[PDB]
UniProtKB/Swiss-Prot annotation:
This protein's name: Histone-lysine N-methyltransferase NSD2
Subunit structure: Interacts with HDAC1. Interacts (via PHD-type zinc fingers 1, 2 and 3) with SALL1. Interacts (via PHD-type 1, 2 and 3) with SALL4. Interacts with NANOG. Interacts with OGT. Interacts (via HMG box) with NKX2-5.
Pathological association: Rauch-Steindl syndrome: An autosomal dominant disorder characterized by poor pre- and postnatal growth, facial dysmorphism, and variable developmental delay with delayed motor and speech acquisition and impaired intellectual. Other features may include hypotonia and behavioral abnormalities.
Residues of the full protein shown: 217 to 364 of 1365
Localization of this protein: Nucleus; Chromosome
Its biological purpose: Histone methyltransferase which specifically dimethylates nucleosomal histone H3 at 'Lys-36' (H3K36me2). Also monomethylates nucleosomal histone H3 at 'Lys-36' (H3K36me) in vitro. Does not trimethylate nucleosomal histone H3 at 'Lys-36' (H3K36me3). However, specifically trimethylates histone H3 at 'Lys-36' (H3K36me3) at euchromatic regions in embryonic stem (ES) cells. By methylating histone H3 at 'Lys-36', involved in the regulation of gene transcription during various biological processes.
Entry similarity comment: Belongs to the class V-like SAM-binding methyltransferase superfamily. Histone-lysine methyltransferase family. SET2 subfamily.
Tissue: Widely expressed. Predominantly expressed in thymus and testis.
PWWP domain: residues covered: 6-64
Taxonomic lineage from the root: Eukaryota, Metazoa, Chordata, Craniata, Vertebrata
Length: 139
């Protein structure tokens, strides 16, 4: 039923990290955004930009920050060991929490923008660099 496209907003669950706001985008070298068990190429929102391929089973549509609590809770049932379960919590403090909060601010802005608007603003530029307007607003 679900098939993501470039510009779609998703929470991504990665080993060693809590659910993080992302945007589906095209891989700069392969030129694809999906491949086959299905994978999608995503950008991680925040001030320290990263990209990666994620499996669909580890993506959930992004609506807003309010979803995080239920994602943390529901994922606990499928993370039986302590090191996995502890990573579901929002980062305690420091630089990782500030990155996650900035990620959420950016994703919430993207969510009230159109697909093309969020793509023009938030897509990374490749030579991987942030769009200068995004970098200035983040600091
Ligand atoms: C895919 C990936 C690649 C590399 C690095 C390491 N990199 C993190 C940023 C600082 C330098 C070291 C982390 C991930 C990653 N895998 O799962 C999540 C979640 C992340 C991630 C964590 C934090 C941030 C991020 C992605 O991008 C946006 C941001 O501002 N911070």
């Amino acid at each position: 039923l679900l098939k993501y496209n470039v510009g779609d907003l998703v929470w991504s669950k990665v080993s060693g990290y809590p659910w993080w706001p992302c945007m589906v985008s095209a891989d700069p070298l392969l030129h694809s955004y999906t491949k086959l068990a299905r994978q999608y190429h995503v950008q991680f929102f925040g001030d320290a930009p990263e990209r990666a391929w994620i499996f669909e089973k580890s993506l959930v549509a992004f609506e807003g920050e309010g979803q995080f609590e239920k994602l943390c809770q529901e994922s606990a049932k499928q993370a039986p060991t302590a090191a996995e379960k502890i990573k579901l919590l929002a980062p305690i403090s420091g630089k990782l929490r500030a990155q996650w909060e900035m990620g959420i601010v950016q994703a919430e802005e993207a969510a009230s923008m159109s697909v093309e608007e969020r793509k023009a603003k938030f897509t990374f530029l490749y030579v991987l660099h942030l769009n200068p307007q995004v970098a200035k607003e983040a600091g």
